[PDB]
Symmetry: C3
Subunit: 318 residues, 3 copies
């Protein structure tokens, strides 16, 4: 069902690859083409083995050498590709967490779209890597119901998918109606408990029943009742419940539509999802925006950066 | 044989309880009665689950919210009740360790009265929680034979209880007599080795034989030969060897007898022992002081603090 | 095949030994003879148990007490003997790593002469003890091809010994000839890959074939082509490949030959190897320098220090 666009290279020889990369950087100048052709054709785990063979053969750190030879958005993409998959989301969160400068978009995007199993692993990686508790750091740099909903999601304690109870679907749809549209102001607490903790399959049914009862999609109510970071988080949670690939496809769309490109977001989504569901993302992107993800990247980016992204994405004729 | 006064609540529903606690704190004011009635009727492990459900439902930290709503001795008691049992003794030790301000009474009380199995667990919890070695911190803030005896006990290497060797009982009783009463000055080293390392059952016999030989109880010799912190520690060790519940009952007695109350000690003993031997402690208290622990607490304390302590203790008609 | 000079004492009683050591230090003055006779006759693991029994009996730290009673080179030797074997090499490396003051001789000696299995264990011990990554610290305080070769060795990824391929022996011997003697300047990279990563048994054959082709021993080429720290490291690697005991015997020889003694090196080699191959080292020493290691130590050292070293080494009539 879920498919990435990068898989293990058949006939992999990490030592041969390390030699190719050394040759690409040795002496004056840099062969960026050899680097991007190789690294985009190896899985993350294979990149780690290449880095180990490179240090064994040459006593040099592969990532440090590439940071010395490469520049600009290409360098940023290559660095992202070399982060072990188990650490990459933690790395992005750590870098989003910076006091008044906190990048809420990143916190929202990752925490809303990762499964409880993924969040458990991220929390552990973050603690091991940075010596800090993710929840503590998030709490320190956020406030209000936005913080509260993030903490709920960080518990990674969403109800498991089990048989649907129709009376429970009715009760929760009515509860949301009473907490929002029928209330002067908003009972955010009720929204957070229901959206944060009920099972995915249960909530998909609640969203349909809510539309039946109220005449609004839950996303319309959220825009009507809330604003600011809480609004963006609740929408990301609802969209992820409906379809993580669709939510991430939408995220890529907005990173590219308009003047320039949100390169940070483009790199993060493509790299983080490349071995999970980037294929599904391409399919949702084409369905919803009548263009290929490929053509939009092709139009928005330049140089070796563009070339590497296109190889990672694929789907020329999506 | 050993019985606490708090046990797991039958029919426990952590999510229901979390909702009750939220309702108790939500909005202006605080329902302290609902909080103390619930938390004193749940075991420590159940309190931890309640805290997890509360954060899952509401994205709020239960202990932090209670610290915001509560005040005074009641707050201090509730905070103590919410500490995981596996960390509580380590927490009290950490807080006793403060340079010139070191609270020797706490070091003595805990280290003398905990079993080797308990001390092994405390040492590990302390290291994990605080990133420091307990023995190192104790050494830094104590000196002299007091320090040495604490280090001996911290090794948690007391001889196991095995069949009693009567000639060994004679030898050790005579050794103690020669090291103290018959010596100009005192051979503290000999007292520390024998009291610190021999088995409990062996030492109970040595104490009786020592009385036979010398005409003094070992506690009388200790008062005659030593003073200061070393005296208090040796007495706590001997009393704990005779009966941990009796030693702790005596500790509670002195925390309350006289002007006011040592509230810190009252909270620590009641909470730390509530699921181990607080029932035995009540029994020893009644035996030795002709009053119930309940009535003494009832007489010495006020308000919600008093109410919560009484529910934890029980034994109205001891 | 490999034999130390110190082994477990038969009939070991750690508690009896702890009492002997206490008696040696108790009161004014110190019985250095009782200390050195006992500790040199116990294995490292037995010394650790003695330290534990000493703290259990007396509440005193054995190593700290000995640091208080002893002085000079004797103290330094006793401290080295008490370090757990699993930490000693890490301890020496940590102490060699000091910015501009870095002791390259120690880095070279340990990293060249330890097996991949040993280096894996050292890296782990270092990280656990000091909270730092050994490779990172080495990189910070070294530079150039010297650093690179150290990093290669630190990977502990040397090819396993397997059946010898004669054509591979020819290829590598010719490669080294082309990289050094036939090249204007030197291809250090090629030397580092081959010497750092090929199997020991393969390299022993390459060294013989290299002599056949070039008329030089590889050590002669290294002196002809390189200098400085890289030279010393490549020679230590080649000598260790030929024979670790021989390399370490040579290291001891130079620590003593000439005005005075390199006491730090003498202590490190004797203690670190005492339970691994110090017997083989003695044999190589006698073979290569026509004197006993014993007689050279006897001639170069004084006092209790001399006595303890001689007991550790043995081999009076080597
Ligand atoms: Ca280059
Ligand atoms: Ca170029
Ligand atoms: Ca760069
Ligand atoms: Ca409303
Ligand atoms: Ca409102
Ligand atoms: Ca809005
Ligand atoms: Ca654009
Ligand atoms: Ca309130
Ligand atoms: Ca109130
Ligand atoms: Ca408060
Ligand atoms: Ca006396
Ligand atoms: Ca005295
Ligand atoms: Ca006294
Ligand atoms: Ca009182
Ligand atoms: Ca002395
Ligand atoms: Ca002396
Ligand atoms: Ca000294
Ligand atoms: Ca040359
Ligand atoms: Ca050159
Ligand atoms: Ca030279
Ligand atoms: Ca000399």
């Amino acid at each position: 069902a879920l498919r990435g666009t990068v898989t293990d290279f058949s006939g992999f020889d990490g030592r041969a690859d390390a030699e190719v990369l050394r040759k690409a950087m040795k002496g004056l100048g840099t062969d960026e083409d050899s680097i991007l052709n190789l690294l985009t054709a190896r899985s993350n785990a294979q990149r780690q083995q290449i880095a180990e063979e490179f240090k064994t053969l040459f006593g040099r750190d592969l990532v440090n050498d590439m940071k010395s030879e490469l520049t600009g958005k290409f360098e940023k993409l290559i660095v992202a590709l070399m982060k072990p998959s188990r650490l990459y989301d933690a790395y992005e969160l750590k870098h989003a967490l910076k006091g008044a400068g906190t990048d809420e978009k990143v916190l929202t995007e990752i925490i809303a779209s990762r499964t409880p199993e993924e969040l458990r692993a991220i929390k552990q990686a973050y603690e091991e890597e940075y010596g800090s508790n993710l929840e503590d750091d998030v709490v320190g740099d956020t406030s209000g119901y936005y913080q509260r909903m993030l903490v709920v999601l960080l518990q990674a304690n969403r109800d498991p998918d089990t048989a649907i109870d129709d009376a429970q679907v009715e009760l929760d749809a009515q509860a949301l109606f009473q907490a929002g549209e029928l209330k002067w102001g908003t009972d955010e607490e009720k929204f957070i408990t229901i959206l944060g903790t009920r099972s995915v399959s249960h909530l998909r049914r609640v969203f349909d029943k809510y539309m039946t009862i109220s005449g609004f999609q839950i996303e319309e109510t959220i825009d009507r009742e809330t604003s600011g970071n809480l609004e963006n988080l609740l929408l990301a949670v609802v969209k992820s419940i409906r379809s993580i690939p669709a939510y991430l496809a939408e995220t890529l769309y907005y990173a590219m539509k308009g003047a320039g490109t949100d390169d940070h977001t483009l790199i993060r989504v493509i790299v983080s999802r490349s071995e999970i569901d980037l294929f599904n993302i391409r399919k949702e992107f084409r369905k919803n925006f009548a263009t290929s993800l490929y053509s939009m990247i092709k139009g928005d980016t330049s140089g070796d950066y563009k070339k590497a992204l296109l190889l990672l994405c694929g789907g020329e004729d999506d």
